């Protein structure tokens, strides 16, 4: 969408008030001296879907990071290859999930998420649109989604 | 978990995936206009005939066809439709004098005596690929008031027996109009119940053996205890909002309306009393009628057991797989495929949004685009 670029990346503070008023979230933390923002409560992605628990994790300067815990989704998965999956993180257990696509490969320098945008506004509906995909991957052995370019080369890292 | 233990809006969910799962097997309407220009021409070529036996004769619709509740035979390409012809000048034909002037009249015709085949009961036309017309002659039957159609059919070891096809039809359609009152808050609906019945009982009966297998439930009894059982719901005014406990109360009360009388099970006719739709159950030789006693009971319980298992399944894909297992595989992936294009479509539209209480996503907070890598 072309806006002004007056808008700039939000301070924690403001970003802190957007998850209580949507959902209902199991705690809301500030840690390292209010440089990281924490989100934390289940996720639903349909009516006769799973249990999940789904935690999110922000610095100013850094890209969100999206982590699921509980159920351990591995075994579920039976060993084969979980498509869609980040480097793991390593102090906050569970698989971690990418959700967006980063700023090298957008042409116009706009990420799909940007710092303007709000933490609960895209990353919690986009982690919940990645779970319902991610079951749908079982039960038909092919992932009927949107996927990434065939990379000949690039890393994306 | 039981199925009546769900919430409304699960057994609203799997009530409509049921429904988009027989939308498949039905017929549709050109292919139904097809089938009845095919007969209304093989009548009017019979009625072309000199002889005056067979000179008047109609041809009208019967059965499954003519009561709306079709369901594509699995594994066969083709379609049934089953109809009857009426002499009015048959009234003491002869067996021989009708078959005769049917057999050589469709004979006659050029297109017709290709794909003639002969059947016990009667004539058949072999039409390539889709679907199948059965003839069946017959004689008026008077001295016997009725709402409708008191009539003699042909069957090969009496020659002659008792029908009445027009007033079982003209029952079944005044029954299904009528609708279950509904709780307020602070096709007919038979017809979709007799065709999920079908659908259940066909996919049970290729996994039993060949004596489970010849003596599955028939179509006729499964029809008329549907009716029974849906006028006592309708008469005792029981207010449904949850739709598969409509079919599982419907369902419920079926085997109450098999009547015994001196070791004799009847399944009767509403109008015609002689119409025995359950005569074989009633023959024992070889034990083969007692056999089918068993089998429909053994098919209600697996049919009762069957929405308990769809109802303790947790996981979008073992709900997908209980589905496979009991309505077959093939009708289920073009739900599947539809609900992804829809997921697709919403996707691009912007109409995808998130619930507030549970995050699960609602498809019509629009999602913006390329939530993956």
């Given at each position: 969408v072309v806006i002004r670029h007056h808008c700039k990346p939000l301070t924690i503070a403001q970003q802190?008030?957007?998850?209580?008023?949507?959902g209902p979230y199991e705690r809301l933390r500030i840690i390292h001296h209010d440089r990281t923002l924490l989100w934390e409560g289940w996720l639903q992605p349909s009516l006769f879907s799973r249990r999940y628990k789904v935690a999110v994790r922000y610095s100013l300067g850094t890209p969100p990071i999206c982590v699921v815990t509980e159920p351990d989704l591995f075994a579920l998965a039976g060993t084969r290859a979980i498509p869609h999956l980040y480097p793991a993180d390593k102090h906050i257990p569970g698989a971690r999930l990418c959700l967006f696509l980063p700023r090298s490969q957008a042409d116009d320098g706009l990420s799909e998420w940007r710092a303007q945008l709000k933490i609960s506004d895209t990353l919690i509906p986009w982690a919940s649109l990645w779970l319902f995909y991610f079951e749908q991957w079982l039960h038909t052995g092919h992932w009927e989604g949107g996927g990434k370019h065939p990379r000949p080369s690039e890393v994306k890292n | 978990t039981t199925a009546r233990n769900l919430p409304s809006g699960k057994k609203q969910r799997i009530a409509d995936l049921l429904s988009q799962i027989i939308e498949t097997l039905d017929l549709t309407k050109t292919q139904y206009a097809n089938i009845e220009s095919a007969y209304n021409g093989v009548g009017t070529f019979l009625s072309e005939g000199d002889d005056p036996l067979l000179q008047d004769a109609v041809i009208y619709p019967q059965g499954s066809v003519r009561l709306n509740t079709t369901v594509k035979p699995k594994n066969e390409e083709q379609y049934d439709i089953d109809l009857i012809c009426y002499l009015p000048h048959a009234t003491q034909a002869d067996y021989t004098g009708v078959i005769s002037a049917i057999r050589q009249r469709l004979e006659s015709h050029k297109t017709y005596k290709t794909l003639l085949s002969e059947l016990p009961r009667g004539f058949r036309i072999n039409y390539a690929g889709d679907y199948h017309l059965d003839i069946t002659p017959g004689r008026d039957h008077t001295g016997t008031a009725h709402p409708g159609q008191p009539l003699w059919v042909v069957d090969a070891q009496t020659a002659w027996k008792e029908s009445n096809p027009s007033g079982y039809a003209e029952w079944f359609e005044s029954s299904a109009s009528v609708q279950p009152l509904r709780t307020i808050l602070v096709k007919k609906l038979l017809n979709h119940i007799v065709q999920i019945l079908k659908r259940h009982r066909d996919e049970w009966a290729a996994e039993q053996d060949e004596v489970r297998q010849r003596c599955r439930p028939i179509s006729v009894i499964i029809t008329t205890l549907a009716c029974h059982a849906y006028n006592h719901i309708i008469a005792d005014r029981r207010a449904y909002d949850n739709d598969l406990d409509i079919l599982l109360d419907v369902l419920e009360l079926?085997?109450?309306?098999i009547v015994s009388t001196q070791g004799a099970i009847h399944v009767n006719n509403p109008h015609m009393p002689?119409?025995?739709?359950a005569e074989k159950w009633n023959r024992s030789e070889q034990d083969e009628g007692p056999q089918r006693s068993e089998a429909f009971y053994q098919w209600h319980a697996a049919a009762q057991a069957t929405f308990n298992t769809i109802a303790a399944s947790v996981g979008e894909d073992n709900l997908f797989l209980s589905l496979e297992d009991s309505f077959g595989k093939t009708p289920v992936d073009v739900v599947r495929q539809r609900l992804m294009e829809h997921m697709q479509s919403a996707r691009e539209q912007g109409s995808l949004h998130l619930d507030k209480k549970t995050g699960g996503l609602i498809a019509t907070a629009g999602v913006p685009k390329n939530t993956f890598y």
């Open positions: 802190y008030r957007a998850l209580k008023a949507g | 079926m085997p109450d309306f002689e119409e025995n739709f």
